[PDB]
Amino acid sequence: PEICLNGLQLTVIRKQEEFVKILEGDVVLSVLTKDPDSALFVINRVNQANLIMADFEIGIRAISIDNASLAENLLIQEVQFLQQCTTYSMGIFVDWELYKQLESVIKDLEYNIWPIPGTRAHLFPKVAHLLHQMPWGEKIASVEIATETLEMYNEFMEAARQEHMCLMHFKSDDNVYIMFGNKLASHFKENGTLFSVPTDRTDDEFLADLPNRAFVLMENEIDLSTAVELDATPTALDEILIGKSVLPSRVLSFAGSIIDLMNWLRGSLSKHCYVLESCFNFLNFIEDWRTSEYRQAHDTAEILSLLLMRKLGTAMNFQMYQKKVELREIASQNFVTNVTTYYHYNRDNHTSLELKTKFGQVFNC
Amino acid sequence: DERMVLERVTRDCVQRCIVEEDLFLDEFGIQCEKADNGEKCYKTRCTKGCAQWYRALKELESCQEACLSLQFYPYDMPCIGACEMAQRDYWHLQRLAISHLVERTQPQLERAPTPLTIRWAMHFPPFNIQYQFVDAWFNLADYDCDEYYVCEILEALIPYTQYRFRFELPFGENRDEVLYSPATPAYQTPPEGAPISAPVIEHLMGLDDSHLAVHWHPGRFTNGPIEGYRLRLSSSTSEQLVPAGRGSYIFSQLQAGTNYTLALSMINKQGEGPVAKGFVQTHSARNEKPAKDLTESVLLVGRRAVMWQSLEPAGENSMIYQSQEELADIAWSKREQQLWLLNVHGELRSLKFESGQMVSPAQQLKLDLWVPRRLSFDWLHHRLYFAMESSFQIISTDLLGESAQKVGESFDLPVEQLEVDALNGWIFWRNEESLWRQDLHGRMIHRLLRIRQPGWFLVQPQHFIIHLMLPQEGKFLEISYDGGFKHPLPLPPPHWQSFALLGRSLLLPDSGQLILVEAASPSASWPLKNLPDCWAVILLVPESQPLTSAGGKPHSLKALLGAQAAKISWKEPERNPYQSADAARSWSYELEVLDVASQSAFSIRNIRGPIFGLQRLQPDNLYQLRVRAINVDGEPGEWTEPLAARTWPLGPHRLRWASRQGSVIHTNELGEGLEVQQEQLERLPGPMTMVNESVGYYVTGDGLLHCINLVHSQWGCPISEPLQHVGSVTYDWRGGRVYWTDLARNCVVRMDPWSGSRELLPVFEANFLALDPRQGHLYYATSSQLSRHGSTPDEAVTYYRVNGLEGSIASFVLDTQQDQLFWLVKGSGALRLYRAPLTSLQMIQQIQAVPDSLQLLRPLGALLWLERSGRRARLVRLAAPLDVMELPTPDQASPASALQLLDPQPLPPRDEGVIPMTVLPDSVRLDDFHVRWQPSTSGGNHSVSYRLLLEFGQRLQTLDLSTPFARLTQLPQAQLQLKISITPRTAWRSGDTTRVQLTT
């Protein structure tokens, strides 16, 4: 067919290698996400992890999505490609925001499309815990929390409620502005403490457009350069993934569903059929991994132990950076043990630290 | 004059029985007059003690056994007190009689060619031999002696150890009664057997990827003359026999990035000793770049030209400076980008260059001060070092000229090369016959080699390695920073006169080319045209002139914590044996303070000094503390081991100090409040025992007990004189009684603070006291034992016993709330702390202390004593016993003899429910018969006992009765007239005495 030869076509008309990144394999998984490199890392680590105990590696078709108004046509092209142009088709993973945005098309196509769990569950308790322990003073302030969508506002006041914090807007001169997005905190002319939590990757335009003395609450992208820095087990990082960065929330939020789906595929190859020439009937009823007999909740140290990345979780941090004109490292919350290290810089060259009362003690309700 | 000492002690004894005729309240309530002379009176019972003090010493009898009376049972206390005071005064006179003869006569050591014998020339008109290590006196267990004091030692001594011997002469049973001889001139024991002490690793570090340095000194017990050492190096084997006097080794030809383990031992004539171990890495290897990938640069210096070369395969060539004269020495700088020049006659020409050309021209620098001959550059302290000709002398100037400072003594031989190691603080130079060393102030002068005519040398500052060529021998050779390590290396044969290292390569100049050999055919060759002679190649890498050292870890972290504050002090990373005193000691520090319960940390970067304070911390919270060192370029070092430290609970905690001069200040838990109080005590006071908020009692260091009233000094003290021979003092808040150990009387004296009525209590040989107020148990400690005294004699519980040669009990404290009982045992070179319940003996820690200084700190749950120097107080918490906090004494009261954490609540008043009510005198009646009285009962229901006195005619009978009925026997006939006294008592007090006269 034409769809197997030309591939996915995005409208000039764009070539397939601009937005699809493929590791080869016998079974083909499809990931449709904003950050494809974390998905390529998760499928690469379950390939070298060998949780399946089978000879065939897991394949990926990682569709890069930059605007959300073109993902429907590439979903139509990917259900045509994974119905026609492959031998075995497990499913199409869509991230949680494009799953909740386009649920009518996914319900109308009736094909095996499952959501990746959302990364804001891995990010917004880290935001509320870095705001809970922050050295502030004895001043209460007026908070104005600006988000892009209202769902981030509901989950942020939920995460502030489990950290025992009340955030109320009094009429006072001391102002705190928390902005949730990549374009809300761009040259803010208001005066006060500015917290800026980005959603996507941080560019040089975002660090250019921020005000002076503004706080940047983001996670660390981890650059991949060699395969010996990931684990003590000798593995092989694939050559496409060298020189590129992963976000750790996307890694963990995809990797829980990957650990559940390959544990289901362990059960399916244990009951059926490991060599894929001898093995037959991989995928008969595949919706049962969403049911709770094979769907489990894993801790993050278990995810790094199962997928052979235990030396990676030292660099899995959530930081808070202040822009002084330089991004000075102020806070650091590790993902694997939730320990929160604040950084103070003795300046004025003193010999003592008067410890300020923290932000969670002032705003305690 | 024995008969004069005996009669003067007996006369002073009967005078003390006369003057104390109405001072002590009796348990039966006797109250004799001044001329009664009956059996029950104080004079006859005390004169019975003074008539039997020398009989008890001749027949080896105790004072309790010499003063046994059937009438007063079980303890006739004025008799026992007069006997013990007369014996203590007699042994005080017998130590003042023979003080100079003991302290003048020195014993002499004798061994005949057979145990070792003391000969003491002592003619007298118990004894202890004490031994001391020669590098505290320890008692000798086994000896065989005679009447001529020829004492032979049969104990197994440690071999090849120098010993001094002393005689301890305990004259009395008091421990202040001892007399010591002068010590013997010292004796070395003969050697036998294997060495029993391991060597001590001073430094064990890695020099570069292939060398590894260890430094050691010998152990304390070598058990012979040291002949050799054995080093076994193993990866996580090479064995080398190093001789007797050497204390360093560098292990060559090792692999990079590898954990190594090294074992030291001592070899005498008899055998090998024990094994000391240490873990060390070599280094990470430098990535050796190929011949194509070389972005670095050199500088080729001739007699009349200086030519810059880039190390590309198509390398750029440029003259920097061409001289009309002959250059003798030149300097270079990486960060200032400055090059200095020198000639045959002295003309210093500095020249700044950047990227291989002129930026600044050759400007002449006259040296404001000796013609200059050699030149080197200090890049840290920014000085120029010159070796001049007048004899030859190294001086140092500044970059502008002037500020001339002469370094070291003058010397005869010329300097052919001068190199300054700024980072390790050294100056290296070579003569015609030798290679040498100095620091930058010229203090430590060492000669590294004596080799006939060496060539060029290059000093590696991180790696502590000096590579040296010998061009006449064709030999390339490798020297440490102390000259002990001489490793020959193979040279690429052509003679070469200069070299450089880029990693492990060798950059050798010929007249036509510079070759880079890792034979004569190189890995890379750069062509030369304009330079016929080349005597120097200087590589333009910042590793040639570094700012920062390799590694750096702090040590000995310690922290004193309050409630809401802390004082954290660490030390600076230590200096290598290849680092001088003028080295780079500039570090910043980073301290990470981890909240354990909250799982949060806060990290203070850019701590300049080795002390940092913290304040507004959380009270009663555990914190873990680790620190690391940040150097000049800003890369971090290694963290320490974490110190778990807990803050005090919330509350104003006053610590009361007392200086040895007698000044009382009040501080807080760190020693920062410093409120000087208006009271002034006597010399060397002990801890203060308060009766109420104003009046307190304290014991000075000479044994005197004083009373001081703080708010008005006229009244409040019922005793007028200070009272002699008092060891400790305590108070009962419930009964209202002051208890002190009478050291002369060998007893415990219980006194009313309002009236001064003293009472002799039968607690014998006690040194320290405590009273448990809930039931009245009197806890006491002898130097041998720790016990308990109660109302019934079934409550005597002994908790610990010391043999006496092991040591003695230093203090004890009583924890009545948690039913715990701690004590300190001062021992033979150790200070041990224990724990037992009041109703399982647990050793808390073994670590000396002031006696009666162990205080219980009920907010922190810790225990605090004061050291014998008086400038340091030690805290051991019960939750973390392995970490001992050292609290510094504040400088107002800086030699301290007392420390006391004050009670924040006031003292409770006198409980009226422990006072026995008096028996009514009309109710004492007659029914072998019985005597009945109205039963005395206190305010609260407590067990009230009674004491009886049956004075009929001249015979008297005493009974101790818990019952209110008196089973009276042993009357001789009918029609007697009884004088009957009843004295009720609780466990806290005694009641008044009710005296009736009834006839049978």
Ligand SMILES: *[C@@H]1O[C@H](CO)[C@@H](O)[C@H](O)[C@H]1NC(C)=O
């Ligand atoms: C994404 O798609 C929309 C569809 O309306 C288009 O207008 C837009 O230019 C595209 N790009 C971005 C960056 O929004």
Ligand SMILES: *[C@@H]1O[C@H](CO)[C@@H](O)[C@H](O)[C@H]1NC(C)=O
């Ligand atoms: C860290 O927090 C997450 C929830 O945010 C929890 O599941 C996890 O167990 C925690 N990890 C620890 C205490 O090591």
Ligand SMILES: *[C@@H]1O[C@H](CO)[C@@H](O)[C@H](O)[C@H]1NC(C)=O
């Ligand atoms: C603190 O020290 C730095 C480094 O020397 C210096 O730049 C700064 O001026 C100092 N600040 C003071 C003394 O306030």
Ligand SMILES: *[C@@H]1O[C@H](CO)[C@@H](O)[C@H](O)[C@H]1NC(C)=O
């Ligand atoms: C070197 O080995 C010792 C034990 O031999 C180990 O405790 C130390 O941490 C090792 N160094 C490394 C690998 O960090």
Ligand SMILES: *[C@@H]1O[C@H](CO)[C@@H](O)[C@H](O)[C@H]1NC(C)=O
């Ligand atoms: C303390 O007691 C003494 C008698 O022992 C008395 O003179 C004094 O007034 C009392 N002081 C206070 C403050 O009660």
